[PDB]
Swiss-Prot record, chain B:
Annotated S-S bridges: 8-42, 20-32, 75-117, 103-130, 135-177, 163-192, 204-254, 215-232, 217-268, 224-247, 293-304
Stretches for region C5b-binding domain: 73-305
Name recorded for this polypeptide: Complement component C6
Family: Belongs to the complement C6/C7/C8/C9 family.
Region (CCP 2): 120-196
Positions annotated with a glycan in the UniProt record: 2, 5, 286
Illness association: Complement component 6 deficiency: A rare defect of the complement classical pathway associated with susceptibility to severe recurrent infections, predominantly by Neisseria gonorrhoeae or Neisseria meningitidis.
Name of the gene this protein is made from: C6
Source taxonomy: Eukaryota, Metazoa, Chordata, Craniata, Vertebrata
PTM info: All cysteine residues are assumed to be cross-linked to one another. Individual modules containing an even number of conserved cysteine residues are supposed to have disulfide linkages only within the same module.
Domain named Kazal-like: residues: 211-270
UniProtKB/Swiss-Prot annotation, chain C:
Gene name as annotated: C5
Protein name: Complement C5b
Activity regulation, short description: Membrane attack complex (MAC) assembly is inhibited by CD59, thereby protecting self-cells from damage during complement activation. MAC assembly is also inhibited by clusterin (CLU) chaperones that inhibit polymerization of C9.
Compartments where found: Secreted; Target cell membrane
Taxonomy of the source species: Eukaryota, Metazoa, Chordata, Craniata, Vertebrata
Transmembrane segments: none
Described function: Component of the membrane attack complex (MAC), a multiprotein complex activated by the complement cascade, which inserts into a target cell membrane and forms a pore, leading to target cell membrane rupture and cell lysis. Complement C5b is generated following cleavage by C5 convertase and initiates formation of the MAC complex: C5b binds sequentially C6, C7, C8 and multiple copies of the pore-forming subunit C9.
Organism: Homo sapiens (Human)
Disulfide bonds: 160-209
Glycan attachment positions: 174
Range covered out of full length: 937 to 1380 of 1676
């Protein structure tokens, strides 16, 4: 349930490409989570696993 | 009417003076009924609340509730290690949140000090403990006047406690703290009792005090059960060598037997050398009085000097 | 084995300032032949909850420049002047910031000249003409004077002798304080107020004029509040004594027991609480509860806790509080100070910290730049074997660095396991 890393990216296309994430030297096994927000000014959320 | 309403001032409750002037004279007989000036509190706001304000009436204790919703999946407030002290106190912690623990005065956190909330309601409880860097001044009593005097004491430092100007603490006089933190009793405390060497108001100890006229004597055995160091005395027609605790020495010498008096000295365990000094106690009123040195044995038994 | 971690404090908010931390590189005897030791590091923390409210600006137009009330007149000015510097906003008025600030200093210059008239040749302070002596005014005045030292200046030799008169005379052997100027159980409560009130004033001026005899007095002063506040007497009594002790050592065992006893007497509104307040009377211009909350607020602000403070500020921002307060300014000044201390605490944590993790004898591994946008840090592998040292610049905020060392350990170490198996 602990947050790992955050990344912000500009969207030109409508398809937002993000730099590849990576698993830490000593990973914590289980089902991870990916949440997305529009930052300013919207509250729109998304969740991936 | 009413007039004189003023802006907030010196003290100041707004004056609002009242005059009886409507009438005007008169056959006399007279005046009017009421108070001339109120003199009600003045108000002020800083304020900028926006305001509005909008408020309703409700109160809680610690209200029972319970506030806890486990559908939100979060941990309760954790129990700190020995000597406790968790910072940023909360009622409910979120999953994945970690809270740092610190030690009360005075110690030092040793090892990894943090508590992380698991997906399940328990805590990680990483290895941590509290090592004692410094030991703190005991509660004791106002009688001392304790040395050395600091806020806290480092390991290896010893403290000395004495009760002036009279009496004594009777022990322990000095103790060092390795945590540890000595062994002072806080239950019975110390409460220094007047020394036997103190001349001033020494006969009032058995008095009690506050009654009646006031302090004189206590009897028969009610002054006993105390340590009462042993002393060897002889009197009252029985005339044996005896021995006796200091409890009954000041007992036998009192309103009761002092008319037949009593005798004397000590501190002999009865004994070898000091015995022949009592031999030798046979000269008292013979043939007139006792003038030698302290041959009168003072009157109230002193040091003497 | 995580085995280590530290919370970096740039401003030294909690106790001492913490910047540099050395993570030692050690080799256990249980180590497997060959292999290696791997270490990972990350950073996180802060995220202040709410910005909440503010104060003034009508007060500047209301009370700034707007017989014996001269004291009450100039007293809040010092507390008001502190907020303006803490909030750092003089920009609200049409006039130039320097024109306003320099105009305010003249009011404080007259304020120190107005408080000088209340000083007797005894170096103490008296209310009317110097006819009688009161410890209360001598204490209350020392709070205001302690505020000046952070701004303009004050002469030590002239101020220091004012503190001596309390220890030389008015400090009881029991540690309690009393004044000359004038239900048996009521006597204990009245002593705690007089004790705590003096502890505040003295603690304020103690830093400007360090003295061994005064420092000795504080040990006996605070210790009196620790042992005698054990039973519950009055919330207001408990509040002031808690704040006086909050100015001292906050890590004291008996102090936490006092704070805990104070939090139980606290009243709230909402689940979770929207507002948190304190009411003195049990089963009870008329509102005296503003003082007990202001002391409790300042107590938690000195404990540097946002979460507990936020509901209290909401209560002092807008309430049935009116007011509706007296002396004054004895009630108001503690609210101004609370809002002054609060605006500081919010400013105290900006998470502007810049963290640089490097090896002791080797080059920089990585550097984290913490902001409001990024409050988090990515796990970084520590492979090469050397002492690891993480440090920070000046910055603003609070952050916690965690470093875990993963080392494969045999198991041929049964010397530790105490079991021979075949
Ligand atoms: C001391 O003096 C008188 C003198 O005649 C003698 O009778 C008496 O027995 C002696 N007193 C004592 C107490 O032995
Ligand atoms: C004096 O009082 C009466 C009522 O007490 C009002 O008519 C009047 O305006 C004034 O306040």
């Amino acid at each position: 349930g602990s947050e790992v890393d955050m990344v912000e990216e500009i969207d030109h296309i409508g398809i937002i490409s993000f730099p590849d994430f990576k698993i830490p030297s000593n990973p914590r096994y289980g089902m991870w989570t990916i949440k997305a927000k529009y930052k300013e000014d919207f509250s729109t959320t998304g969740t991936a696993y | 009417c009413w007039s004189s309403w003023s802006t907030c001032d010196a003290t100041y409750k707004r004056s609002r003076t009242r005059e009886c002037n409507n009438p005007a004279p008169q056959r006399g007989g007279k005046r009017c009924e009421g108070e001339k000036r109120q003199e009600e509190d003045c108000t002020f706001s800083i304020m900028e609340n926006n305001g509005q304000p909008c408020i309703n009436d409700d109160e809680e204790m610690k209200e029972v509730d319970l506030p806890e919703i486990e559908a939100d999946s979060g941990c309760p407030q954790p129990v700190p290690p020995e000597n406790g002290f968790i910072r940023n106190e909360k009622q409910l912690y979120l999953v994945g949140e970690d809270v740092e623990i610190s030690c009360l005065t005075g110690f030092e956190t040793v090892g990894y000090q943090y508590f992380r909330c698991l997906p399940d309601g328990t805590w990680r409880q990483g290895d941590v403990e509290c090592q004692r860097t410094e030991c703190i001044k005991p509660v004791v009593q106002e009688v001392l006047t304790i040395t050395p005097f600091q806020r806290l004491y480092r390991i290896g430092e010893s403290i000395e406690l004495t009760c002036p100007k009279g009496f004594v603490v009777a022990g322990p006089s000095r103790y060092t703290c390795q945590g540890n933190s000595w062994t002072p009793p806080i239950s019975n405390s110390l409460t220094c009792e007047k020394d036997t060497l103190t001349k001033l108001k020494g006969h009032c100890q058995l008095g009690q005090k506050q009654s009646g006229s006031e302090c004189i004597c206590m009897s028969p055995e009610e002054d006993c059960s105390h340590h009462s160091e042993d002393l060897c005395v002889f009197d009252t027609d029985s005339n044996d060598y005896f021995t006796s605790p200091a409890c009954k020495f000041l007992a036998e010498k009192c309103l009761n037997n002092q008319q037949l008096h009593f005798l004397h000295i000590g501190s002999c365990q009865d004994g070898r050398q000091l015995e022949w000094g009592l031999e030798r106690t046979r000269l008292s009123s013979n043939s007139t009085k006792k003038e030698s040195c302290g041959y009168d044995t003072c009157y109230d038994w002193e040091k003497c000097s | 084995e995580s085995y280590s971690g530290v919370t970096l404090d740039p401003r030294g908010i909690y106790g001492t300032i913490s910047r540099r931390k050395e993570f030692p590189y050690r080799i256990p005897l249980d180590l497997v032949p060959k292999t290696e030791i791997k270490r990972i590091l990350s950073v996180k923390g802060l995220l202040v909850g709410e910005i909440l409210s503010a104060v003034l600006s009508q007060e500047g137009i209301n009370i700034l420049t707007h017989a014996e009330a001269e004291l009450m007149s100039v007293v809040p000015v010092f507390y008001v002047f502190h907020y303006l510097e803490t909030g750092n906003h003089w920009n609200i008025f049409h006039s130039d910031p320097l024109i306003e600030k320099q105009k305010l200093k003249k009011k404080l210059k007259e304020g120190m000249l107005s408080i000088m008239s209340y000083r007797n040749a005894d170096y103490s302070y008296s209310v009317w003409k110097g006819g009688s002596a009161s410890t209360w005014l001598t204490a209350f005045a020392l709070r205001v004077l302690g505020q000046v030292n952070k701004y303009v200046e004050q002469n030590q030799n002239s101020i220091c002798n004012s503190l001596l008169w309390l220890v030389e005379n008015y400090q009881l052997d029991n540690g309690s304080f009393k004044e000359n100027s004038q239900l048996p159980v009521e006597a204990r409560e009245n002593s705690l107020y007089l004790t705590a009130f003096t502890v505040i004033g003295i603690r304020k001026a103690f830093d400007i004029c360090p003295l061994v005899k005064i420092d000795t007095a504080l040990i006996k002063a605070d210790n009196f509040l620790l042992e005698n506040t054990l039973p519950a007497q009055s919330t207001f009594t408990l509040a002031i004594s808690a704040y006086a002790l909050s100015l001292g050592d906050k890590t004291h065992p008996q102090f936490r027991s006092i704070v805990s006893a104070l939090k139980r007497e606290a009243l709230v509104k909402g689940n979770p609480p929207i507002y948190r307040f304190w009411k003195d009377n049990l089963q009870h211009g008329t509102a005296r509860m503003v003082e007990t909350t202001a002391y409790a607020l300042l107590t938690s602000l000195n404990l540097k806790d946002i979460n507990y403070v936020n509901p209290v500020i909401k209560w002092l921002s807008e309430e049935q509080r009116y007011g509706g307060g007296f002396y004054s300014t004895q009630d108001t000044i503690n609210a101004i100070e609370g809002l002054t201390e609060y605006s500081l605490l919010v400013k105290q944590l900006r998470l502007s910290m810049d963290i640089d993790v490097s090896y002791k004898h080797k080059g920089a591994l990585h550097n984290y730049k913490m902001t409001d946008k990024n409050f988090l840090g990515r796990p970084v592998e520590v492979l090469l074997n050397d002492d690891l040292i993480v440090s920070t610049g000046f910055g603003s905020g609070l952050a916690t660095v965690h470093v875990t060392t993963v080392v494969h350990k045999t198991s041929t170490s049964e010397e530790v396991c105490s079991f021979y198996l075949k």
